[PDB]
Ligand binder design. Structure first.
Ligand SMILES: CN(c1nnc(-c2c[nH]c3c(F)c(F)c(F)c(F)c23)o1)[C@H](CCN1CCCC1)c1ccccn1
Length: 131
C-alpha cells in the first residue's frame, strides 16, 4: 500500500525515465489518496503535455491553480501547454506570471523562463506576420 508522497516520487522518477503514461498513473494514485495537493496535478499536467493530451493538461493546470495560486510550476506548464495549442497571448501571460512568481519566491530556474518567453513571443509574431 504506497503513500501519496511515495506515489508522487515514483511518478517523478518515471517521468525522468520518459515513461509518461506510467508516471501519470502514479500521480493519479497519489491524487486518490490526497486530492488536495497541487503538485500532483501540475506534475501530471506535464505528463499529459508529453502525451499530446493538451485538453487534459489544461484541466490539470486548472485543478492545481485552484489549490495553489502561487504555483510557479503550474503557470509555467500552463503557458507551455497554451503555446503548443497556439493560444499565444495566454501562453505569454502565464510564462510572464511564472517569471514574476519565481522572482517573488527567490527561485532560480536559470534562463528557462525568459528563454520560454522569447520562444513564445517569436512564435506569436511569426504567426501574425504570416497570418
Ligand atoms: C522536471 N521537474 C521539474 N520541476 N521543476 C521543473 C522546472 C524546470 N524549469 C522550470 C521553470 F522554468 C519554471 F518556471 C518552473 F516553475 C518549473 F517548475 C521548472 O522541472 C520535476 C522533477 C524534479 N527533479 C527532482 C529535483 C530536481 C529535478 C518534474 C516535474 C513534472 C513531472 C515530473 N518531474
Amino acid at each position: 500500500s504506497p503513500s501519496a508522497q511515495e506515489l508522487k516520487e515514483q511518478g517523478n522518477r518515471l517521468f525522468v525515465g520518459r515513461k509518461y503514461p506510467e508516471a501519470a498513473a502514479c500521480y493519479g494514485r497519489a491524487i486518490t489518496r490526497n486530492p488536495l495537493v497541487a503538485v500532483y496535478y501540475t506534475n501530471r499536467a506535464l505528463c499529459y503535455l508529453k502525451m499530446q493530451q493538451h485538453e487534459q493538461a489544461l484541466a490539470d493546470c486548472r485543478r492545481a491553480l485552484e489549490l495553489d495560486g502561487q504555483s510557479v510550476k503550474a503557470h509555467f506548464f500552463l503557458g507551455q501547454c497554451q503555446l503548443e495549442m497556439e493560444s499565444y497571448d495566454e501562453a505569454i501571460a502565464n510564462l510572464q506570471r511564472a517569471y514574476s512568481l519565481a522572482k517573488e519566491q527567490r527561485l532560480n530556474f536559470g534562463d528557462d523562463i525568459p528563454s520560454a518567453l522569447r520562444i513564445a513571443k517569436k512564435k506569436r509574431w511569426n504567426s501574425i506576420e504570416e497570418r
